[PDB]
Amino acid sequence: QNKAEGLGMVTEEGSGEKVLQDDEFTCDLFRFLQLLCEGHNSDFQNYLRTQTGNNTTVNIIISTVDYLLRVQESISDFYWYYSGKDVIDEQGQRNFSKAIQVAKQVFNTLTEYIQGPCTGNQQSLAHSRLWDAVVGFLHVFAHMQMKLSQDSSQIELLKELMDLQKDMVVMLLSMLEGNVVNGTIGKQMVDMLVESSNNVEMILKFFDMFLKLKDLTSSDTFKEYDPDGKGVISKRDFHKAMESHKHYTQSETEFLLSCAETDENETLDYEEFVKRFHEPAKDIGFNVA
Amino acid sequence: MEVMVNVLGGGESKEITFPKMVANCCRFLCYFCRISRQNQKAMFDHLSYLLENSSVGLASPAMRGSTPLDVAAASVMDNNELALALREPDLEKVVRYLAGCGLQSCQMLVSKGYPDIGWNPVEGERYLDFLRFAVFCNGESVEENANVVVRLLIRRPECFGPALRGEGGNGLLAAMEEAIKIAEDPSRDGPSPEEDDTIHMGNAIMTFYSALIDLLGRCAPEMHLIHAGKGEAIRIRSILRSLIPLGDLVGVISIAFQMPTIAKDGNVVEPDMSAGFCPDHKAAMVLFLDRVYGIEVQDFLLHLLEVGFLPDLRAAASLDTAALSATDMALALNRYLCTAVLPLLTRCAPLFAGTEHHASLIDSLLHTVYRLSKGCSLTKAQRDSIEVCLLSICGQLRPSMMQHLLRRLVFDVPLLNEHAKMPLKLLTNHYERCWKYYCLPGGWGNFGAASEEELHLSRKLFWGIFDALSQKKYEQELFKLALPCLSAVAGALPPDYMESNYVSMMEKQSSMDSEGNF
Amino acid sequence: EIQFLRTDDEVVLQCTATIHKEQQKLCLAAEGFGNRLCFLESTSNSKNVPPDLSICTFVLEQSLSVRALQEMLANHRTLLYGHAILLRHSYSGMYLCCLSTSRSSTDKLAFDVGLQEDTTGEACWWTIHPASKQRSEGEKVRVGDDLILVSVSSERYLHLSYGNGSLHVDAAFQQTLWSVAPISSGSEAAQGYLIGGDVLRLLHGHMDECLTVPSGEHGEEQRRTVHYEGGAVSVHARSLWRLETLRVAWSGSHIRWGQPFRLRHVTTGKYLSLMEDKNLLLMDKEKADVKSTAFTFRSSKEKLDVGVRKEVDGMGTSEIKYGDSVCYIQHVDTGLWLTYQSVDSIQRKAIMHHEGHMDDGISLSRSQHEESRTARVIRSTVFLFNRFIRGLDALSKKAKASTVDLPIESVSLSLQDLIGYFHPPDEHLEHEDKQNRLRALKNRQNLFQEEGMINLVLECIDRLHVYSSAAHFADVAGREAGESWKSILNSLYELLAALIRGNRKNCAQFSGSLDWLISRLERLEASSGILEVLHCVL
């Protein structure tokens, strides 16, 4: 489709129904199953996993995580296609948004499957292929959080993906719900973590790199740099404050400078900066902690 | 479509009931696609059905262009949006049908009595035509479809026919020789208990192999991608090179046709085009050569020119008589040359620089091209192709060799007929390029200097054109075009020129003979 | 529980062939020096003929996605289906690849498969795909799982040719299904403990003498006897043995007390065996049956044999340790114990006894990889150069040229490989690395001279000089031999110069043969090489 528009010929579909054929259908299908188990409906939660009366049993819980693995692979491949290219086009942004919405709905459905300490569903998804999907999403999050934050035109994609990460961590917490000492679910989760050591390490560095931004802004050194109520601080002032604070390294300094959008006036608003970065960082960091 | 669906579903096993109306509906759908581009997409929306109902009447001749496979080809024909939106399973179904045709015998023909072979050329040719239309669109090659098709073709090697399949196949050249031998053989060619009654097995085999070669050559990546160095394109091109050896292509090009002849009574005895080696077979070979292997080596170019290209052009020249010109052999030869050979020689124009050691060969090429230009059945576009090719070749052609062409031109260009116009351009550009060769005694050191025979011939050309233009009736375009030529000749001739009072006598009597100069 | 193949794990690729209505189990094999083309080694009848897994083992360096492969070409993780994996041949150190050249066995589409020195390019890389519908893209590749490999460069599958008389492995569009066996994994292998496939020296209880064969001055079938030598032989290639387990899978595991294994002599290629007369004797691979060639390590002389124990899939528990653990070799079937006969250049005969003496303790010392590779290279060179000399002898005896086999291409290729092996270090290299290369080159030259590689080269030079001219050699042998006569003759002299250069002991042993060399200095076809050799010796 991209080559089709590039060659200049008229296209019936602008966004393109060919990629992600039916986005509303999958979302409705998984929202139906999430509503079916909402309210910690343990009876229907167990009946989805094992139909006792029926002659043959279909594991909806396993099929859901299979679809989650497939959509994780699709998202990872789309990321890998877009890794080299500097800027994400509109079609890429729409496809990422639709895929992230679908993944978020699947994670919500899995979370409603596993909440209400449903031990059967928890043990089924423990032995299912959830861990590979989670480790794929962890790498995707580790690399998007570096890439998108540097640019300023994909902030909506960044926040949608950060919400996806929060939902994944809530799903992991619901897995850990009702855990026992030296539990098999915990062992498998730590195996997943040590498998994804580098990705989660990068995510944690990205989180605690922006979690100190509130302290940096509230420091008196920044206050004397910006005594104005309007708060639009100069880029040079913010840059020099970032080493005067003595808690940000040079790499963090240059990364925040790159992640800092500036107007033609060569200045930045620390208020918009912090509300743009810190809040998702705190929200997801609490769940990770 | 619903009428055709009902009839095709009714009694599908026992061939097709009421084949005439099915053919009429397929023709109507093809024409509906051809009417407008949106109708083509509307028909493309149901391309899936035509694929599982492709094997309807492919074996039976006289239904060509009126089968569901033809309707699918028309729906996917020359539409880039449709070619790009074409899916991979749709190509896979056709590839599977081609594999089935390559593995299995043709039950209908062997039932009617045709000799039994292990593969189906008549269906395979149609299935290869559909793949050609799927992969190739508007001069360019759709890389996405071409890579999928070539990958499926190499995953199923049985699609290549017994010769190129690889279990001890005799090779492309051997297969072509055996097919012609079958063609002259009456027993193997026909069932032996007008054309639809007797499908010629040799022609089926040659058309199958030429269609496979044509499809692979069209699937070859574009040269711009090769220059960019894209690894997938390099891989596909190397795979095609491995699939088809260059020597087999050279041999098939070297194979000669059978020229028509008149009989004892003098009546033209013309072998039927439905039985024999077609120029389109060589046209596919040339296309594969130029798109896959690439023509960039000078000695290779001249070797191919001698072995396969020049004999065919000389045969076309010898079959330029007015009675034999109207024969469809001559038309097919002119079509093949002007579509493949002359464009290839025009693209190979820079390589024609170092041809001193093959002066006889290059002079023979010039003479044959000129004789084909001096023709009647030659169409307007064919004349254009001849003009461009000859003007390109004579451009980089070294002035030493073309004095044969000059000495034959100085006798027939003074006529100032419409056939003299491209000699006029040729002389104009040649003298403009080789101005300092003639005027300056030293000239180019590598080229040398005039032998004074060229100088005398240029004197004769100047005087003949000058006189014939005075005696010539007014045509303002003719005086536009003859002006630069006359001026270039006058400038090239050194003002202090010595016309030898002792000229050479007893010249080539064939040159003055206007009946073909032979 | 199911294991998964990871990077840096050593594996063996197996293929199944039902030749003549009987199923055979084959393995992908390749030899570093000499023929680079891969060949298949049968492992079905391991009972009567031992398998040579040493040249069949491959290690999985890197597993990467196809797009990552594209990016790295433009400018421990478990194996997952769909990745592109890189295989390094364990012995040679080269990488498996498509050679882009074919033997043209009426399969013009197929491409031959061999080894490549450099990993650069997409030829070395191969992609693993699911064999059946149970497997799927992206999931972990289980151990003991059948796999199909796809060439990245040529898009040709690893194929086993059935139609030809001799089975060949090549890259063809048809699919041959390959199973993967975990031969070993050095990631969790404890250092200092004996594992299968090692090359070791059997040291007698006086930790001074090795279990060695007669030296290289004695001819073949006089080297078949087994005895004890001490002193300089401990640092030679005639004291090296390889412990080969009777199991194909997991043959690199730690050796347990009582595990049956075969001891193969590295330099000769023969297997230790027990003859019916209770006398130890080296005996050939073809007749190397399990019954004759089976020996076990026992911690104590006490007679309570372990009997039968279940085999464990993996490294297992490390029991035998190098240099400290005392091992007593006993034959499995006969039950006798290895001991010194104590006959009355020590030449302590090794004999096979029901009871034996008390000081039968045998220590184990691990041999370096460089020395093991040098010994294997020596064995291969011995085989190839003996074939060459026998062919030349037949040609001299006037046997028909077609009947006689003359390894023209293989001898030349092995000669260039040996030149590369004995190439002196370059000067721009760092000092410590240069000193290490000098030490390695000196060790290689010493091992070659101790195995007597000089005399073989001298014999080849003489039997090539019996033909005066290239035209004369082309009249006697084939025309290709005629063209290769100059190249092989020059390469042999260059090899001799490389073997003698910088080695005072080798140049001293070459003093006797100097007079032979100077007698042909007048010959123009070898004057430069003869003069270079003379200069080095002087």
PDB file of N, CA, C and O in Angstrom, chain B residues 151 154-155 157 160 164-169 231-232 235-236 238-239 242-243, chain C residues 69-70 105-109 111 122 150-157 173-174:
ATOM      1  N   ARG B 151      10.125 -17.492  -6.303  1.00  0.00           N
ATOM      2  CA  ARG B 151      10.308 -18.360  -5.146  1.00  0.00           C
ATOM      3  C   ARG B 151       9.398 -19.580  -5.199  1.00  0.00           C
ATOM      4  O   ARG B 151       9.853 -20.693  -4.918  1.00  0.00           O
ATOM      5  N   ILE B 154      10.821 -21.958  -7.872  1.00  0.00           N
ATOM      6  CA  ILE B 154      11.997 -22.725  -7.475  1.00  0.00           C
ATOM      7  C   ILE B 154      11.678 -23.711  -6.350  1.00  0.00           C
ATOM      8  O   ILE B 154      12.336 -24.750  -6.242  1.00  0.00           O
ATOM      9  N   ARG B 155      10.682 -23.415  -5.508  1.00  0.00           N
ATOM     10  CA  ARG B 155      10.256 -24.394  -4.512  1.00  0.00           C
ATOM     11  C   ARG B 155       9.589 -25.593  -5.172  1.00  0.00           C
ATOM     12  O   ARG B 155       9.713 -26.725  -4.690  1.00  0.00           O
ATOM     13  N   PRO B 157      10.203 -27.248  -8.445  1.00  0.00           N
ATOM     14  CA  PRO B 157      10.989 -27.307  -9.687  1.00  0.00           C
ATOM     15  C   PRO B 157      10.292 -28.030 -10.827  1.00  0.00           C
ATOM     16  O   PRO B 157      10.729 -27.890 -11.977  1.00  0.00           O
ATOM     17  N   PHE B 160       9.116 -26.253 -14.237  1.00  0.00           N
ATOM     18  CA  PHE B 160      10.036 -25.803 -15.273  1.00  0.00           C
ATOM     19  C   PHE B 160      10.042 -26.700 -16.504  1.00  0.00           C
ATOM     20  O   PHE B 160      10.742 -26.389 -17.472  1.00  0.00           O
ATOM     21  N   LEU B 164      14.326 -28.536 -17.949  1.00  0.00           N
ATOM     22  CA  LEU B 164      14.950 -27.712 -16.924  1.00  0.00           C
ATOM     23  C   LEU B 164      14.594 -28.167 -15.513  1.00  0.00           C
ATOM     24  O   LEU B 164      14.940 -27.485 -14.543  1.00  0.00           O
ATOM     25  N   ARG B 165      13.906 -29.304 -15.380  1.00  0.00           N
ATOM     26  CA  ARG B 165      13.514 -29.782 -14.059  1.00  0.00           C
ATOM     27  C   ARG B 165      14.718 -30.221 -13.232  1.00  0.00           C
ATOM     28  O   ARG B 165      14.772 -29.945 -12.029  1.00  0.00           O
ATOM     29  N   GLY B 166      15.686 -30.898 -13.848  1.00  0.00           N
ATOM     30  CA  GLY B 166      16.946 -31.190 -13.195  1.00  0.00           C
ATOM     31  C   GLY B 166      17.205 -32.638 -12.835  1.00  0.00           C
ATOM     32  O   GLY B 166      18.223 -32.916 -12.191  1.00  0.00           O
ATOM     33  N   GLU B 167      16.328 -33.568 -13.213  1.00  0.00           N
ATOM     34  CA  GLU B 167      16.604 -34.981 -12.977  1.00  0.00           C
ATOM     35  C   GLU B 167      17.278 -35.599 -14.199  1.00  0.00           C
ATOM     36  O   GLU B 167      16.848 -36.642 -14.705  1.00  0.00           O
ATOM     37  N   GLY B 168      18.363 -34.979 -14.655  1.00  0.00           N
ATOM     38  CA  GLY B 168      18.995 -35.405 -15.886  1.00  0.00           C
ATOM     39  C   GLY B 168      18.383 -34.809 -17.131  1.00  0.00           C
ATOM     40  O   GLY B 168      18.445 -35.426 -18.200  1.00  0.00           O
ATOM     41  N   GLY B 169      17.783 -33.625 -17.020  1.00  0.00           N
ATOM     42  CA  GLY B 169      17.186 -32.996 -18.182  1.00  0.00           C
ATOM     43  C   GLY B 169      18.215 -32.677 -19.247  1.00  0.00           C
ATOM     44  O   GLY B 169      19.358 -32.316 -18.957  1.00  0.00           O
ATOM     45  N   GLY B 231      20.053  -6.464  -2.007  1.00  0.00           N
ATOM     46  CA  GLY B 231      20.484  -7.847  -1.887  1.00  0.00           C
ATOM     47  C   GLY B 231      19.458  -8.843  -2.392  1.00  0.00           C
ATOM     48  O   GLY B 231      19.812  -9.856  -2.996  1.00  0.00           O
ATOM     49  N   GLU B 232      18.175  -8.576  -2.142  1.00  0.00           N
ATOM     50  CA  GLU B 232      17.134  -9.486  -2.605  1.00  0.00           C
ATOM     51  C   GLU B 232      17.084  -9.530  -4.130  1.00  0.00           C
ATOM     52  O   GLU B 232      16.938 -10.604  -4.726  1.00  0.00           O
ATOM     53  N   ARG B 235      19.998 -11.518  -5.327  1.00  0.00           N
ATOM     54  CA  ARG B 235      19.757 -12.939  -5.107  1.00  0.00           C
ATOM     55  C   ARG B 235      18.837 -13.513  -6.177  1.00  0.00           C
ATOM     56  O   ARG B 235      19.098 -14.591  -6.721  1.00  0.00           O
ATOM     57  N   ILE B 236      17.753 -12.800  -6.496  1.00  0.00           N
ATOM     58  CA  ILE B 236      16.813 -13.292  -7.503  1.00  0.00           C
ATOM     59  C   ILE B 236      17.485 -13.369  -8.870  1.00  0.00           C
ATOM     60  O   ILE B 236      17.304 -14.339  -9.619  1.00  0.00           O
ATOM     61  N   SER B 238      20.709 -13.726  -9.544  1.00  0.00           N
ATOM     62  CA  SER B 238      21.635 -14.855  -9.535  1.00  0.00           C
ATOM     63  C   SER B 238      20.907 -16.193  -9.602  1.00  0.00           C
ATOM     64  O   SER B 238      21.396 -17.126 -10.251  1.00  0.00           O
ATOM     65  N   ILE B 239      19.754 -16.309  -8.941  1.00  0.00           N
ATOM     66  CA  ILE B 239      18.968 -17.536  -9.025  1.00  0.00           C
ATOM     67  C   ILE B 239      18.520 -17.782 -10.457  1.00  0.00           C
ATOM     68  O   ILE B 239      18.575 -18.913 -10.952  1.00  0.00           O
ATOM     69  N   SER B 242      21.437 -19.016 -12.466  1.00  0.00           N
ATOM     70  CA  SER B 242      21.685 -20.432 -12.204  1.00  0.00           C
ATOM     71  C   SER B 242      20.639 -21.312 -12.879  1.00  0.00           C
ATOM     72  O   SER B 242      20.962 -22.385 -13.401  1.00  0.00           O
ATOM     73  N   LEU B 243      19.377 -20.875 -12.869  1.00  0.00           N
ATOM     74  CA  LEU B 243      18.308 -21.659 -13.481  1.00  0.00           C
ATOM     75  C   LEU B 243      18.530 -21.835 -14.976  1.00  0.00           C
ATOM     76  O   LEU B 243      18.404 -22.948 -15.502  1.00  0.00           O
TER      77      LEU B 243
ATOM     78  N   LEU C  69      20.087  -9.805  10.520  1.00  0.00           N
ATOM     79  CA  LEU C  69      21.087 -10.267   9.567  1.00  0.00           C
ATOM     80  C   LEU C  69      21.254  -9.305   8.403  1.00  0.00           C
ATOM     81  O   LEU C  69      22.388  -9.031   7.997  1.00  0.00           O
ATOM     82  N   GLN C  70      20.152  -8.798   7.854  1.00  0.00           N
ATOM     83  CA  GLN C  70      20.244  -7.800   6.794  1.00  0.00           C
ATOM     84  C   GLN C  70      20.956  -6.536   7.261  1.00  0.00           C
ATOM     85  O   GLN C  70      21.805  -6.001   6.538  1.00  0.00           O
ATOM     86  N   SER C 105      26.303 -33.085 -10.651  1.00  0.00           N
ATOM     87  CA  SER C 105      25.916 -34.488 -10.733  1.00  0.00           C
ATOM     88  C   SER C 105      24.523 -34.620 -11.333  1.00  0.00           C
ATOM     89  O   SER C 105      23.626 -35.200 -10.712  1.00  0.00           O
ATOM     90  N   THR C 106      24.339 -34.082 -12.543  1.00  0.00           N
ATOM     91  CA  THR C 106      23.043 -34.061 -13.227  1.00  0.00           C
ATOM     92  C   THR C 106      21.974 -33.394 -12.363  1.00  0.00           C
ATOM     93  O   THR C 106      20.783 -33.692 -12.465  1.00  0.00           O
ATOM     94  N   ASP C 107      22.413 -32.479 -11.494  1.00  0.00           N
ATOM     95  CA  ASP C 107      21.558 -31.726 -10.583  1.00  0.00           C
ATOM     96  C   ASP C 107      22.020 -30.266 -10.634  1.00  0.00           C
ATOM     97  O   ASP C 107      22.300 -29.640  -9.613  1.00  0.00           O
ATOM     98  N   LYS C 108      22.120 -29.739 -11.861  1.00  0.00           N
ATOM     99  CA  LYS C 108      22.701 -28.417 -12.093  1.00  0.00           C
ATOM    100  C   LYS C 108      22.115 -27.350 -11.175  1.00  0.00           C
ATOM    101  O   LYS C 108      22.791 -26.362 -10.864  1.00  0.00           O
ATOM    102  N   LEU C 109      20.866 -27.522 -10.736  1.00  0.00           N
ATOM    103  CA  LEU C 109      20.267 -26.554  -9.823  1.00  0.00           C
ATOM    104  C   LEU C 109      20.917 -26.596  -8.446  1.00  0.00           C
ATOM    105  O   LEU C 109      21.016 -25.559  -7.778  1.00  0.00           O
ATOM    106  N   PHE C 111      23.580 -26.790  -5.330  1.00  0.00           N
ATOM    107  CA  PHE C 111      24.866 -26.195  -4.997  1.00  0.00           C
ATOM    108  C   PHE C 111      25.537 -27.035  -3.921  1.00  0.00           C
ATOM    109  O   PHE C 111      24.886 -27.448  -2.956  1.00  0.00           O
ATOM    110  N   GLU C 122      26.338 -13.570   3.366  1.00  0.00           N
ATOM    111  CA  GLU C 122      25.125 -14.297   3.712  1.00  0.00           C
ATOM    112  C   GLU C 122      25.206 -15.779   3.365  1.00  0.00           C
ATOM    113  O   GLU C 122      24.231 -16.507   3.573  1.00  0.00           O
ATOM    114  N   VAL C 150      17.397 -23.722   5.705  1.00  0.00           N
ATOM    115  CA  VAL C 150      17.225 -22.992   4.455  1.00  0.00           C
ATOM    116  C   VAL C 150      18.396 -22.034   4.297  1.00  0.00           C
ATOM    117  O   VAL C 150      18.702 -21.264   5.214  1.00  0.00           O
ATOM    118  N   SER C 151      19.048 -22.083   3.139  1.00  0.00           N
ATOM    119  CA  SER C 151      20.178 -21.206   2.868  1.00  0.00           C
ATOM    120  C   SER C 151      19.689 -19.790   2.595  1.00  0.00           C
ATOM    121  O   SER C 151      18.764 -19.584   1.802  1.00  0.00           O
ATOM    122  N   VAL C 152      20.304 -18.813   3.263  1.00  0.00           N
ATOM    123  CA  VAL C 152      19.935 -17.418   3.041  1.00  0.00           C
ATOM    124  C   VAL C 152      20.407 -16.955   1.668  1.00  0.00           C
ATOM    125  O   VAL C 152      19.672 -16.287   0.929  1.00  0.00           O
ATOM    126  N   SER C 153      21.644 -17.303   1.307  1.00  0.00           N
ATOM    127  CA  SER C 153      22.232 -16.792   0.072  1.00  0.00           C
ATOM    128  C   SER C 153      21.595 -17.426  -1.160  1.00  0.00           C
ATOM    129  O   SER C 153      21.243 -16.727  -2.117  1.00  0.00           O
ATOM    130  N   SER C 154      21.439 -18.749  -1.158  1.00  0.00           N
ATOM    131  CA  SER C 154      21.028 -19.480  -2.348  1.00  0.00           C
ATOM    132  C   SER C 154      19.579 -19.941  -2.314  1.00  0.00           C
ATOM    133  O   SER C 154      19.077 -20.417  -3.339  1.00  0.00           O
ATOM    134  N   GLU C 155      18.892 -19.807  -1.178  1.00  0.00           N
ATOM    135  CA  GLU C 155      17.514 -20.281  -1.026  1.00  0.00           C
ATOM    136  C   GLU C 155      17.383 -21.746  -1.432  1.00  0.00           C
ATOM    137  O   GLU C 155      16.413 -22.155  -2.074  1.00  0.00           O
ATOM    138  N   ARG C 156      18.377 -22.546  -1.054  1.00  0.00           N
ATOM    139  CA  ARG C 156      18.398 -23.971  -1.355  1.00  0.00           C
ATOM    140  C   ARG C 156      18.526 -24.749  -0.055  1.00  0.00           C
ATOM    141  O   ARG C 156      19.389 -24.443   0.774  1.00  0.00           O
ATOM    142  N   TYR C 157      17.668 -25.749   0.116  1.00  0.00           N
ATOM    143  CA  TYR C 157      17.638 -26.515   1.352  1.00  0.00           C
ATOM    144  C   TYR C 157      18.822 -27.475   1.410  1.00  0.00           C
ATOM    145  O   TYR C 157      19.360 -27.894   0.382  1.00  0.00           O
ATOM    146  N   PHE C 173      16.732 -27.476  -3.969  1.00  0.00           N
ATOM    147  CA  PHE C 173      15.401 -26.956  -3.674  1.00  0.00           C
ATOM    148  C   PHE C 173      14.546 -27.972  -2.926  1.00  0.00           C
ATOM    149  O   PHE C 173      13.630 -27.585  -2.192  1.00  0.00           O
ATOM    150  N   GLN C 174      14.822 -29.263  -3.096  1.00  0.00           N
ATOM    151  CA  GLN C 174      14.119 -30.276  -2.327  1.00  0.00           C
ATOM    152  C   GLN C 174      14.582 -30.251  -0.872  1.00  0.00           C
ATOM    153  O   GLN C 174      15.664 -29.757  -0.544  1.00  0.00           O
TER     154      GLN C 174
END
